[PDB]
């Protein structure tokens, strides 16, 4: 396989379906990436992650650069070998969780994580898709602060590009994505898109939109922001999201997604179904012998009842977290498969309407 090749096989409106071919595997798009917060997708063996249909996972960098440390993971053979996942891994830059979980300057953030150090950490982990180091502008932001933040991020995008390219093994085997910023402002989104395309990246993320602005506003910003990106490269909406967010983002040209919702909320008792989410802890499930979802093909829904999973979660049992997480990730992957197939068949608009009618009934 090549280092990186994105091919679009079918289109419907702004929606696209296709593949990204990388050295460690093929990624079917639109793609959902389960999140590994600290070298594990919580409560799942990697073979179970793969069994749900995931082609690629997102590895957070922030925790690993603190413990065990990027150099130690490299010494142990890289993140893939360490955690036992041999397919592509996309790593974030570590900057976002540095702020959320500090002194910012033009050189980077002290808490020193510079663009150069972020790229190096992602190299030491052995990332397949490296994210440029930037700032996720807070929401809401004044136009002046959004502009200042975006402009710095574009300077850091060039520094990220140059650091990536300076390291032969990384440039030849990994890919690099740039991140569009600009808050909710069309002119800043355009300037950011232009700056990133001038630098040149393997894919383009839409950053700064998983920030509490609400779906209407997110969709409004995507409406004008995604067309600004190069059409022939993947479009990655970072940190999104709920099932209906994903469907509407695909309708607007997004190819890649990640979020902790299916894993984190799964451990908290929320199960996704085609009839909307349910909280399995609710007393109404105490004697419900049906599976979590009536159509889901996952191993959890083949074998165990709502009643049992209700009992496990209310008991705090580890198997409850395991089963909820496997189902939720499998549900997300089945959603992505239905999206891909419906685009391929030119019936995605109908699928989106049917999905929403039943999910929000």
**305 among annotated binding-site residues:** no
Q: Which of 39, 65, 131, 296 is in the footprint of Zn ion by CB under 5 A?
A: 296
Segment contacting Zn ion (CB under 5 A): 120-128, 137-145, 232-240, 294-302? 294-302
Segment contacting its own copies (CB under 8 A): 73-81, 115-123, 251-259, 344-352? 73-81
Closest CB 229 distance from Zn ion, rounded Å = 34
Q: Which of 22, 31, 44, 228 is in the footprint of its own copies by CB under 8 A?
A: 44
Q: Which of 11, 19, 26, 68 is in the footprint of its own copies by CB under 8 A?
A: 68
Closest CB 131 distance from its own copies, rounded Å = 23
Question: Residue 301 or 322: which CB sits closer to Zn ion?
Answer: 301
By the rule CB under 5 A, 327 interacts with Zn ion: yes
**Quick check: is 92 catalytic?**
yes
**181 among annotated binding-site residues:** yes
**259 among annotated binding-site residues:** no
Q: Which residues contact 84 (CB under 8 A, 6 or more apart)?
A: 45, 46
By the rule CB under 8 A, 305 interacts with its own copies: yes
Closest CB 329 distance from its own copies, rounded Å = 14
By the rule CB under 8 A, 67 interacts with its own copies: yes
Catalytic residue among 55, 92, 245, 255: 92
- Please note each residue after which the chain is broken, C-to-N distance over 2.5 A, or write none: 101, 111
Closest CB 323 distance from its own copies, rounded Å = 8
Helix then strand then coil, % of the chain, to nearest 5: 45, 15, 35
179 in Cβ contact with 207 (< 8 Å) = yes
Helix (H, G, I), strand (E, B) or coil at 283: helix
Three state DSSP letters for 236-267: EECCCCCHHHHHHHHCCCCCEEECCHHHHHHH
Q: Which of 51, 197, 319, 344 is in the footprint of its own copies by CB under 8 A?
A: 319
By the rule CB under 5 A, 123 interacts with Zn ion: no
Question: Residue 171 or 299: which CB sits closer to its own copies?
Answer: 299
Site size with Zn ion, rule: CB under 5 A: 5
**Quick check: is 255 catalytic?**
no
**296 among annotated binding-site residues:** yes
Segment contacting Zn ion (CB under 5 A): 4-12, 82-90, 282-290, 321-329? 321-329
Question: Residue 109 or 124: which CB sits closer to its own copies?
Answer: 124
* Binding string, residues 244-283; x marks residues near Zn ion by CB under 5 A: ----------------------------------------
Catalytic residue among 128, 202, 255, 258: 258
Looking at the annotation, which residues are catalytic?
92, 258
Binding residues for Zn(2+): 296, 298, 301, 327
Residues that bind its own copies (CB under 8 A): 38-40, 42-45, 63, 67-68, 72, 75-77, 82-84, 286-287, 289, 303-305, 307-308, 311-312, 314-315, 317-319, 321-322
């Amino acid at each position: 396989r090549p280092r990186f090749s994105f091919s679009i096989a079918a289109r419907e409106g702004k929606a696209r379906t296709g593949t990204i071919e990388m050295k460690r595997g093929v990624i079917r798009t639109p793609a959902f990436m389960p999140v590994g917060t600290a070298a594990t997708v919580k409560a799942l063996k990697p073979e179970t992650v793969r069994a749900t249909g995931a082609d690629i996972i997102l590895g957070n960098t922030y925790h690993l650069m603190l413990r065990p440390g990027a150099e130690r993971i490299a010494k142990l053979g890289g993140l893939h070998s360490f955690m036992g996942w041999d397919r592509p891994i996309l790593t974030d830059s570590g900057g976002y969780q540095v702020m959320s979980l500090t002194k910012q300057s033009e050189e980077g953030v002290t808490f020193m994580l510079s663009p150069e150090r972020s790229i190096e950490i992602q190299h030491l982990l052995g990332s397949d898709i490296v994210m440029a180091f930037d700032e996720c502008t807070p929401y809401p932001a004044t136009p002046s602060r959004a502009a200042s933040s975006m402009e710095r991020s574009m300077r850091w995008a060039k520094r990220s590009r140059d650091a990536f390219d300076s390291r032969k093994e990384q440039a030849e085997n990994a890919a690099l994505f740039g991140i569009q910023q600009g808050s909710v402002f069309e002119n800043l989104r355009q300037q950011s898109a232009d700056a990133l395309a001038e630098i040149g990246f393997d894919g383009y993320a839409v950053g700064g939109l998983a920030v509490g602005e609400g779906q209407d506003e997110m969709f409004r910003v995507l409406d004008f922001s995604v067309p600004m990106l190069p059409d022939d490269k993947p479009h990655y909406l970072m940190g999104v999201g709920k099932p209906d967010d994903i469907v509407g983002a695909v309708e607007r040209g997004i190819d890649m997604f990640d979020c902790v919702l299916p894993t984190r909320s799964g451990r908290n008792g929320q199960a996704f179904t085609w009839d909307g989410p349910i909280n399995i802890r609710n007393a109404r499930f105490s004697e419900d012998l049906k599976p979590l979802d009536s159509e889901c093909h996952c191993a959890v829904c083949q074998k165990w009842s709502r009643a049992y999973i209700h009992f496990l979660i209310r008991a705090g049992e580890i198997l409850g977290a395991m089963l909820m997480t496997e189902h939720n990730i499998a549900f997300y992957q089945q959603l992505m498969q239905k999206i891909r197939d419906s685009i391929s068949e030119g019936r995605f608009s109908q699928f989106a309407q049917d999905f929403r009618a039943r999910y929000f009934a």
